[PDB]
Design a protein around this nucleic acid. Structure first.
Lengths: 88, 351, 226
RNA sequence: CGUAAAGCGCACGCAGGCGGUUUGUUAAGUCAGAUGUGAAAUCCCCGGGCUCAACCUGGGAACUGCAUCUGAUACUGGCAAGCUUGAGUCUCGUAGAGGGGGGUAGAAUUCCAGGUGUAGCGGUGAAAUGCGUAGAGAUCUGGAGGAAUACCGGUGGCGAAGGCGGCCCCCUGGACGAAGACUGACGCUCAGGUGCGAAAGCGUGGGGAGCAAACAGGAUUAGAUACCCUGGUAGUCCACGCCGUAAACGAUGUCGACUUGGAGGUUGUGCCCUUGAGGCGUGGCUUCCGGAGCUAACGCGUUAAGUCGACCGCCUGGGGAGUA
């Protein structure tokens, strides 16, 4: 479930270094990679409600982080949603 | 000040937990309760039976000092576990010295094997050892003068469960309980075990290195149901018990205790059961078909209404004999199964 | 100082948490009462005993404990004081109005049975009236000569005679007790943190109280007056 | 608002409400003053006049307000810059009937075929209906099919709730702890809305061992549309939709803080003599007993029904009625 090489790849790709792992663009990028991974799991299986509640949880978590980032810095907000690809 | 703090760590330094430091001075004696004061919270309610030596009478007056034991604190009110176990440590030290000495020399006198090793008794205590330990070779102390004087040379000890078999005569010669539970197994290996707590259905004798035995209520004696084990044996006492059963799963070794006065009953069936021996016995309750003489050590129900005289049916034993009186009665039958001796009274001189 | 008796500390785990000022958890899972704080409270108790006994007041000694039974009688009849050691009757102080005529039965019955009709009626009547005297005698014998309400109550176990404390807190009697670790120091005015169940302790505390009483009743002022 | 009426079945979540901590600025809220206005009559106070009073009337007070100007900046709000305790992320593990899909194992029940064998079986409080000489019941061998997973099983575990027990694989959610690093208030609650939601039931297609509403029969009974017995169809099972209710219960909304103890369970972890199932601490979840305090009492009692704070739902006599 989003293996350690993938997480280190996304932290190093969106952050400052391999230590700045908790910034907002990094957390949004890990949540987005996780959601887009689990879309293949909820393509089939169709009934895993107990896992889809975790999916909806990290969807809302991503949305509140994006709402914070849009509220603080609109520049990196547009760079993040355009670098990442979302908003319907 | 720190006088008291230092005083506290001092008093910690000048006591220990087990029965090691002989400190309690006997400050009141009354039969049947001794009591000491070893620098603990209260004063022990000591039995008298942890302190009489080898013939029954007391040995220690006021001021005398034996250590007791510890590591158990407050059952409501009071302090200790008994000093007699204390003594066990001393015995262990002497045994260690012999093992340590390379040998231990005292006196060991072993007449017979309850469970395959002569019993050896050192000072007050008597211990049980595996069968080889009693004799160096195949000499066998059965031909020796009974309860003979040697020493004990150790043959075998079990090191966890306390069984020690020692070497009489021949002076010249010089997880854990439950995997291999086949040592005391085979049908009836007698053991010497201290009882712990009697749970009104049981007695819980358990000695052999971290096990549990019951001897529940059915055997215990040669009466079944009216017995109440607290009346009949003891609390905290080393007794005659053997296995009778070991269950591998469920971990319930079900020991017994009737393997004793059962023999007395057998002797009564025999001793006086050889043919038609006469007995002088006292009746206890006449139950309209007999008189129930029950003298001679627990032999149960006896003479029937059919003999009683030289008339058969009309007699009604309350009219003809007594209540509580010693009579002529001879044996006429001992039945080995179903525990019925059947005495009679017609064997007299009228016809 | 653990002076001569051993009054170090108690039980194990069922301490009353109100006695957090007097604890030291030992290695054997047993509490140690703070003996360097016990002594100021005990001296604050004896300084009250000299005052209210030099008032010519009446101390009532209470402790049963199955072991401190005889230490109260022995260590209290040495003074001119009064004791209850066998059975604590419910209401000997706040229902003393009806304990009074039971005392009248005891005194008025040993008056009849030391010389009077202790043989004049029936052997069975002697077996009744005498058994009555040995029933009331170790129930009211120490309180027999009191004839009033006491001015103090010296309790040896608050946890065992807690109804004697509440008894003499319905009315205004200053009680004080040597408490254990599991006892409750609430009704007790002058709390003495120590050993309740040691014969050495109920010799020591009760003996020093016995010294403060008879040494406290002026033998000096009276002498001067004379 | 546990049991009296009353906590949504449980969550997510937009608007709404509320918001840790420091500095600076603003002065919107807030406070203070002033001015204008708040009609007169009426109420209230001190007077006056009717012979007194009711009544009339002089002066004031008040008209709890609104607007403007001038200031105060402690709190609240707006703005800028922070801070790390709240919240969140990452590196290691840890346990678990958490979920979805697939596969497989053993015991047992039923049936079918065959063997041996013969007079009963089954059932009850007693019986009969029923099955059996057309060979039953029993016993053995083989086969088929369906369903549930003994023991482990633990006032144990996981899950938001409903709920989830053979074993194995694949895909996957959450929690917990140790040591650090990182972001910097990103938080709490939430009407409407959306989602999940035992059993029964409904629709489509399969499947059907055992059980079992309806139904039949035998009893029982004064009657017996029942309990009891013999049978027995929907349903129970699977796949896909619907329904959206339960004594959906801890009859106790969620989140946060604080406030004496004890005995246990389970799950991590640190130190030291792991030298011995050892001792001293430390987090999480959980069971019981009890302290103050609370409560109408029962009881609750650090997992509160104690002391408080934020937000929401709900109650206002019983029946009619959760009905039209």
């Amino acid at each position: 479930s989003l293996s350690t090489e993938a997480t280190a790849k996304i932290v190093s790709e969106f952050g400052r270094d391999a230590n700045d792992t908790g910034s907002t663009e990094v957390q949004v990028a890990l949540l987005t990679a996780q959601i887009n991974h689990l879309q293949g799991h909820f393509a089939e299986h169709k009934k895993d409600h107990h896992s889809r509640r975790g999916l909806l949880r990290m969807v809302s978590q991503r949305r509140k982080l994006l709402d914070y980032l849009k509220r603080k810095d609109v520049a990196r907000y547009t760079q993040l949603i355009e670098r990442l690809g979302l908003r319907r | 000040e720190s006088f008291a703090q230092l005083f506290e760590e001092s008093l910690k330094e000048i006591e220990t937990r087990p029965g090691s430091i002989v400190r309690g001075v006997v400050v009141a004696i009354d039969k049947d309760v001794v009591l000491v004061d070893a620098g603990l919270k209260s004063e022990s309610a000591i039995p008298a039976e942890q302190f009489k030596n080898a013939q029954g009478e007391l040995e220690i007056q006021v001021g005398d000092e034996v250590d007791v034991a510890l590591d158990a604190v407050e059952d409501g009110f009071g302090e200790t576990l008994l000093s007699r176990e204390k003594a066990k440590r001393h015995e262990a030290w002497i045994t260690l010295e012999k093992a340590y000495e390379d040998a231990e020399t005292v006196t060991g006198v072993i007449n017979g094997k309850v469970k395959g090793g002569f019993t050896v008794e050192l000072n007050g205590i008597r211990a049980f050892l595996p069968g080889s330990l009693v004799d160096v070779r195949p000499v066998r102390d059965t031909l020796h003068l009974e309860g003979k004087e040697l020493e004990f040379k150790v043959i075998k000890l079990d090191q966890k469960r306390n069984n020690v078999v020692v070497s009489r005569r021949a002076v010249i010669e010089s997880e854990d309980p439950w995997v291999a539970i086949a040592k005391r197994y085979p049908e009836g290996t007698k053991l010497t075990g201290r009882v712990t707590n009697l749970t009104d259905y049981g007695c819980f004798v358990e000695i052999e290195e971290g096990v549990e035995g019951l001897v529940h209520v059915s055997e215990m004696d040669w009466t079944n149901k009216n017995i109440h084990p607290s009346k009949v044996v003891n609390v905290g006492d080393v007794v005659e018990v053997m296995v009778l059963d070991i269950d591998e799963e469920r971990r319930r070794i079900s020991l017994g205790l009737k393997q004793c006065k059962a023999n007395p009953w057998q002797q009564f069936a025999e001793t006086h059961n050889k043919g038609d021996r006469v007995e002088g016995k006292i009746k206890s309750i006449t139950d309209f078909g007999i008189f129930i003489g029950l003298d001679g050590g627990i032999d149960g129900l006896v003479h029937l209404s059919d003999i009683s005289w030289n008339v058969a049916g009309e007699e009604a034993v309350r009219e003809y004999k007594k209540g509580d009186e010693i009579a002529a009665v001879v044996l006429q039958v001992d039945a080995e199964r179903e525990r019925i001796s059947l005495g009679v009274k017609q064997l007299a001189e009228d016809p | 100082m653990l002076k001569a008796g051993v009054h170090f500390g108690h039980q194990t785990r069922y301490w009353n948490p109100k006695m957090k000022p007097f604890i030291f958890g030992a290695r054997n899972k047993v509490h140690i009462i703070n003996l360097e704080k016990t002594v100021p409270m005990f001296n604050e108790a004896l300084a009250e005993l000299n005052k209210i006994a030099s008032r010519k007041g009446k101390i009532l000694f209470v402790g049963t404990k199955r072991a401190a039974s005889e230490a109260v009688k022995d260590a209290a009849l040495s003074c001119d004081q009064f004791f209850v050691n066998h059975r604590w009757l419910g209401g000997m102080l706040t229902n003393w109005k009806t304990v009074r005529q039971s005392i009248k039965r005891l005194k008025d019955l040993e008056t009849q049975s030391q010389d009077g009709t202790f043989d004049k009626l029936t052997k069975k009547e002697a077996l009744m009236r005498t058994r009555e005297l040995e029933k009331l005698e170790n129930s009211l014998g120490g309180i027999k000569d009191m004839g009033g309400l006491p001015d103090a109550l010296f309790v040896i176990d608050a946890d065992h005679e807690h109804i004697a404390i509440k008894e003499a807190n319905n009315l205004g009697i200053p009680v004080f007790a040597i408490v254990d670790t599991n006892s409750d120091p609430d009704g007790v005015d002058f709390v003495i943190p120590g050993n309740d169940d040691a014969i050495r302790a109920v010799t020591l505390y009760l003996g020093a109280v016995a010294a403060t009483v008879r040494e406290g009743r002026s033998q000096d002022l009276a002498s001067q007056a004379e």
